[PDB]
Symmetry: C3
C-alpha cells in the first residue's frame, strides 16, 4: 500500500472544501435566516461546537468510527491517532488525510444542527448535546455505513452521506425543533443566505467528488453529477414555486440548490448523468413539498431539516434505482437485484432515522437534566 | 490515452474555482453595484440562469461546442453525454472533467451578462435570451476557438477566453444596455463589490491556470502571469485615477483588478512575466479610459461590459505581440510572423463582436416578441 | 530534478488559498473591526498594497529573498525572473510555482499590517512604508529563514512563518500603533469579522500544508495539526473568556482561531497531533492574556498584532520542544538536543523582533519625512 501524491493532493484540497462548508458556509446560511439579535450567538455556537467536534474526532471519534470493532462501533486503538504511523496508507492516500477528510463530514453534520437551534438552546446545553450525539449517533452511523459495520456489510449504497450526514442531522434537528423552538419572521439578510448557499455548493464538490478517495473517473462522475443534480433541483424547485406561488424567490432558488445537493449526495458516484438530472428534479420538487408541509406542522429556521430529511430519503431510495447499469449507473454488486437493493436502502434509512432520533432525544434530555435546555 | 490523476485532481479543483466565479463571485460583484431594491431579483436570475446553463450544457451544449462537426458547430453525438465512456480520456484527463471544466466557462460568461441586466429584464425573457444566446453564440464561438473550428484552424491564440468569454459577453451586454436599460445611482454596498471582485480573482486562477488542461509548466506560467497582470492593472488603473481624479477609489481598485484579469485571459499561457506586466498596465489604463467613455454615451452597471470588452480586445491584440519568443513568450507557431498573428487576432475579435452582437439582438428580439423584454 | 505534476497541482492550489487569505480574508477581518467611515479607504489600501507587493516580488523580491547570496540577502540574478527557465525545477515543482507560493506569503504579511493601520496613515505614506519594509525586512528575514541564510544555517525551525510572517508583521504593526494611532469603539460588523476569520482559516490550509512543498506525509501532518491546533485554541480562548468574563463572545471565538493558526504555523510540519493540541490550548490562552495586556497599554484594531506577536513567539518556542521524537514530533536534526534547539528558537525570535522593529521605524520615519505619515 503506497500513497499516490495526486490522490493525497486531491483529498487534502477536498477536505479544505468540506471544512469551508461549515466555516463559514452553514453559519452564513443560517445567519441570514434568523433574527438579527440572535446572529452573533449562533455564529459563536457554530464556531465553538465546530472546534469541539474537531477535538473529539482526533481524541476518539476517528478511532470509534473507523477502527475495526463490531457492526456498530470501532475501537479505542487509535486514541489521539496513536499507533497510526505517519506514512500509514489507507486506500491510496496517507491515513492522516483520511482522518481529516472524515472529520470534516462530522463537522458539517453538527453545523447543520447547531446553526438552526442555537437561537433556542443554552450555550452549555448545546455543548453537552454535541458530545452525546456525535459520540452515540454520528460515530456509530459512520461506522455502520462507511466503517465496515452493519449497513455496509449488507451492501448499502451511500456515496457521500445521505444517511450519515443529511438524514442523521435532519432527524436530530427535527427532534430538537419539536422539544424546544419558539411556536408562532421573514429572513432578514437574503444576500447572506445566498452567500452561504454558494459556499455550501462550492464546498460540496470536495464533499461529493472527494468521497471517491482518489482523483479517478468516479470522482469525475460524482463531480459532474453534482453540477447536474444541483441545477436540475434549482429548476424543479423554481418551477414549482412559479406554479404554486406565481413567481420564483431567492430563498426558493437557494433551497432548490440544497435540495439537489442533498438528493445527489448518496447517489453521486453510482449513477449516470441522466439519473442525476432525474434525481435533481425530483429532489427539488420533494424539497418544496417538504418545507411546505413541515411549515404546516411547525419560529426557527427548519428549512434545512425539511430539505435535508426529505431529500436525503429521496436520494437514498433513488440510489437503489439509478445505480442500475440499465439506467446508466455503475451497476449493483454481483447478484444484487434492484428489488433487493431498494430494500437495503429503505432499511438503512429506517435505522438511521430511529437511531439518530433516539440518541438526539437522550442528548437533549441529558442537557436539560444537567444545565437546562432552553436558553435562560 | 491514459488519464493522469494529478491532472484530474488539478482540473476538478480548477473547475470548482471557475464555478466559484459565478456562484457567488459575479452575483456579489453586481449585487453591490445595483439599487438595493433590485438585489434579490438579480440574485435569483443569476442562480436560475446558472442552473439553466448547467443543464443545456450537458443536454447538448458540450456536444455542439466540442464534438467534431464543421468550422462553426460540433454535432449531436454526445447528447446527455451519450457515447462518452466513463473512462474516456481527453488530453491527459477524463473527458467528464473536460465536460465540467468547459461548462463552467459557459456559466461565468452568462453570469457576466445576467447580473448587469437582471434589473431591467422580465424573468421569462432572460430565460429565453439565455437559451438563444448560449446556443447560437457561446456554443459556436467556443467551437470555433477551442473546438477545432474556424478561428483555431487559422491559428488564433486565446488561452482562456478573451474572445469566447470576455468580448462575447461584453457585446451581448452592450446590445442589451442599448435596447433596454434605464436612461439617466452611486453603488450601495462597496464592501460587497470588493468581496465579489476577490472571489472572481481567486476563482480566476482555476480559469487561467486550468486552461492548460494539466498541472505543467504552462499552468505555472499562466498562474504567475495572472498574479502579475492583475497587480499591474490595479496599479495602472489607480495611478490614472489619482492623476485624473486626485485620489484612488475602492471601485477603481476592483475595476483595475478585473481589467488585468480580463486583459491577461487570452495571453496568460503564451507570454512572459514581462509581457504580463506590460499587458496589465495597458489593460488597467484602457479599462479606465473605456468606462470613462462608455459612461459618456450611457442607470445600470455597465462597468463590467466596458472593462470586459475593451480589455478583452486589448488582451487579444497584445497576445499577438507578446507571444513572440523575442519578447519572452512561448513563441508563435512554425512559419508565423508577428504581423500574420496580429492579423489573425484582429479577425478573431471582429468575428466575435459581430457574431455575438447579431445573436444577442436576435435573442432580445425573440424574447420581446414572445413575452416582452422590459420588466413589467 | 524533474517536476512531479501532483506536487505542481497541490502547490498552485495552495498558492491560490494563500492569496485568498489576503484577498479578501484579512480585508474582511479588519473591515468588520474598524469604524464604518474608514472601511472603504482601508479596503483600497489593502488592495493597492497587495498589488504593489505582487509587482515588487517578481521585479526583485523573489531574487533577493531566494537567490543565493550571503547570510542576509540573495542576489539580483533573477530580476523579473530572468534566467529562470520555464521548466526549471525547485524541489519537486516548477520554480515558477515556488515564486508564486513564496510571493503569496509576502502578501499576507503586508496585509496584516496595512489592514489595521490604513485608518491612520496617508495613502502615499503606506506605499512608501511597504516598499521600505518589504525590501529591508520581509526579504532579508525570508532569506535568513527559508533562503539558506543566517537562521536556517543555524538550524532554526519555522515550518510556515512564525517568524517571517507572524512576528515580523506584529512588530512592524506595533511600532506603527505606537507612532501613530488614535489614543482613547466596539466592532461594527462582527458577521464580517467571522467571514474574514473563516476565509483566513480555510486559506491557512494552503499556507500550512503547502509549506511542505509536496503532497506528502508532512503536508498531511501539517494539515491535521492545523485542524487540531485551531480547534484547541478556540476552546482555550473561549474557556478563559467564560472564566474571566462569564460568557464567550464571537470576537473571542474568532481571535482564538487566529491564535491557534498562528501558534501552530512554525510547528505544524514538525510536531505530533498531541503537540498540536497542547500548542493550540496554550496559544489561545496566551492570545487572550496578550490582547488583554496590550489593551491595557494601548483606537485602532491591534487585536491581530497582539495575537500574531504573542502567539508567534509561543509557537516558535514550543516548536523547539514538541519537534522532539519523544513527544511525537518528527525529531530534531542529528546531534541537536532540545536545549540547543530552544536556544536557536529564541535567538531567531530575538533577531526577527529587532530587525523588523528597526526597519519598520525607518520605514515610518522615511514616509513621514517625505509625505507625512498621519492621514491629512
Amino acid at each position: 500500500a503506497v500513497a499516490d501524491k495526486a490522490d493525497n493532493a486531491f483529498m487534502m484540497i477536498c477536505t479544505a472544501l468540506v471544512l469551508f462548508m461549515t466555516i463559514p458556509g452553514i453559519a452564513l446560511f443560517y445567519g441570514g435566516l434568523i433574527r438579527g439579535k440572535n446572529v452573533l450567538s449562533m455564529l459563536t455556537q457554530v464556531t465553538v461546537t465546530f472546534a469541539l467536534v474537531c477535538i473529539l474526532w482526533v481524541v476518539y471519534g476517528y478511532s470509534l468510527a473507523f477502527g475495526e470493532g463490531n457492526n456498530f462501533f470501532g475501537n479505542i486503538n487509535w486514541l489521539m491517532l496513536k499507533n497510526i504511523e505517519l506514512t500509514a496508507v489507507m486506500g491510496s492516500i496517507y491515513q492522516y488525510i483520511h482522518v481529516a477528510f472524515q472529520g470534516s463530514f462530522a463537522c458539517i453534520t453538527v453545523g447543520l444542527i447547531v446553526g438552526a437551534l442555537a437561537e433556542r438552546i443554552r450555550f452549555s446545553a448545546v455543548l453537552i448535546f454535541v458530545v452525546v450525539w456525535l459520540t452515540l449517533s454520528y460515530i456509530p452511523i459512520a461506522h455502520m455505513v462507511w466503517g465496515g459495520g452493519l449497513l455496509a456489510s449488507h451492501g448499502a449504497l451511500d456515496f457521500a452521506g445521505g444517511t450519515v450526514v443529511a438524514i442523521n442531522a435532519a432527524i436530530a434537528g427535527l427532534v430538537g425543533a419539536y422539544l424546544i423552538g419558539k411556536r408562532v419572521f421573514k429572513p432578514h439578510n437574503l444576500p447572506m443566505v445566498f452567500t452561504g448557499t454558494a459556499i455550501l455548493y462550492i464546498g460540496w464538490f470536495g464533499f461529493n467528488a472527494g468521497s471517491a478517495g482518489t482523483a479517478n473517473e468516479i470522482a469525475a462522475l460524482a463531480f459532474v453529477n453534482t453540477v447536474v443534480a444541483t441545477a436540475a433541483a434549482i429548476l424543479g424547485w423554481i418551477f414549482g414555486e412559479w406554479a404554486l406561488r406565481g413567481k420564483p424567490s431567492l430563498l426558493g432558488a437557494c433551497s432548490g440548490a440544497i435540495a439537489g445537493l442533498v438528493g445527489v449526495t448518496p447517489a453521486c458516484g453510482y449513477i449516470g448523468v441522466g439519473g442525476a438530472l432525474i434525481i435533481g428534479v425530483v429532489a427539488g420538487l420533494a424539497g418544496l413539498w417538504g418545507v411546505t408541509m413541515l411549515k404546516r406542522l411547525l419560529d426557527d429556521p427548519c428549512d434545512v431539516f425539511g430539505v435535508a430529511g426529505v431529500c436525503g430519503i429521496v436520494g437514498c431510495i433513488m440510489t437503489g434505482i439509478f445505480a442500475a447499469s440499465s439506467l446508466g449507473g455503475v451497476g449493483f454488486a454481483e447478484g444484487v437485484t434492484m428489488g433487493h437493493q431498494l430494500l437495503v436502502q429503505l432499511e438503512s434509512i429506517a435505522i438511521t432515522i430511529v437511531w439518530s432520533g433516539v440518541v438526539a432525544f437522550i442528548g437533549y434530555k441529558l442537557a436539560d437534566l444537567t444545565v437546562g435546555l432552553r436558553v435562560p
